Amino acid sequence: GDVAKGKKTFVQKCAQCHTVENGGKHKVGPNLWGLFGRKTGQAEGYSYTDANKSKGIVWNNDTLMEYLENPKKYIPGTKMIFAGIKKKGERQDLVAYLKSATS
Ligand code: HEC
């Protein structure tokens, strides 16, 4: 898991819609501070869809790796409109960074 390459991905692919830092604003999507170890649909102040709220699983390495490959198949109904990151190595690196930058 390479945190410098995952950071590049994030800025490329996610940053338009998300922030990571403590305090960080909700943009199109929620801020993601806290996210590991949290159940889905849990960032304070954000209005999620009832899908992302009710999925009910906890965000950890394994589940973030599955969700990122295809977000709409994992959360049918999500308003996170983004196709996925298909390649396993870029997903690892990108998970390895979120881990770092969200606590
Ligand atoms: C804007 C077009 C987005 C892009 C680009 C990415 N995401 Fe996103 N995301 C967006 C929204 C509107 C939402 C809420 C979904 C809903 O159904 O309510 C989200 C949500 C997430 C979540 C879930 C947060 C929760 O607390 O469970 C995560 C973990 C997440 N998004 C991660 C993420 C990453 C890593 C992205 C880059 C590849 C990414 N998102 C892109 C909108 C958009």
Contacts 24+ apart (CB under 8 A), 62-69: 64/95, 64/98, 65/91, 65/92, 65/95, 68/94, 68/95
User: Measured between alpha carbons, how far is residue 82 from residues 1, 4, 22, 72, 76 in Å?
Assistant: 22, 22, 24, 8, 13
Question: What would the two tokens of residue 60 be?
Answer: 């950890």
Pocket lining: 49 vs ligand 1, CB cutoff 6 Å: yes
Ligand 1, atom 26, lies closest to the CA of 41
Q: What structural domains and CATH numbers belong to the chain?
A: 1-103 (1.10.760.10)
Instruction: Determine phi and psi for 24, rounding to 5 degrees.
Output: -65, 150
State the resolution, in angstroms: 1.8
Asked if residue 80 belongs to a known ligand binding site, the reply is yes
Q: Bridge partners of 39? A: 58
Calculated CA dihedral for residues 80, 86, 88, 91, nearest 10 degrees: -30
Any atom of ligand 1 within 6 Å of the Cβ of 17? yes
The widest CA-to-CA distance across the chain, in whole angstroms, is: 34
Cα–Cα distance, 56 to 40 (Å, whole number): 6
Count CB atoms within 10 A of the CB of residue 7.
19
16 lines ligand 1 (CB under 6 A): yes
Tokens representing 7 are 């950071």
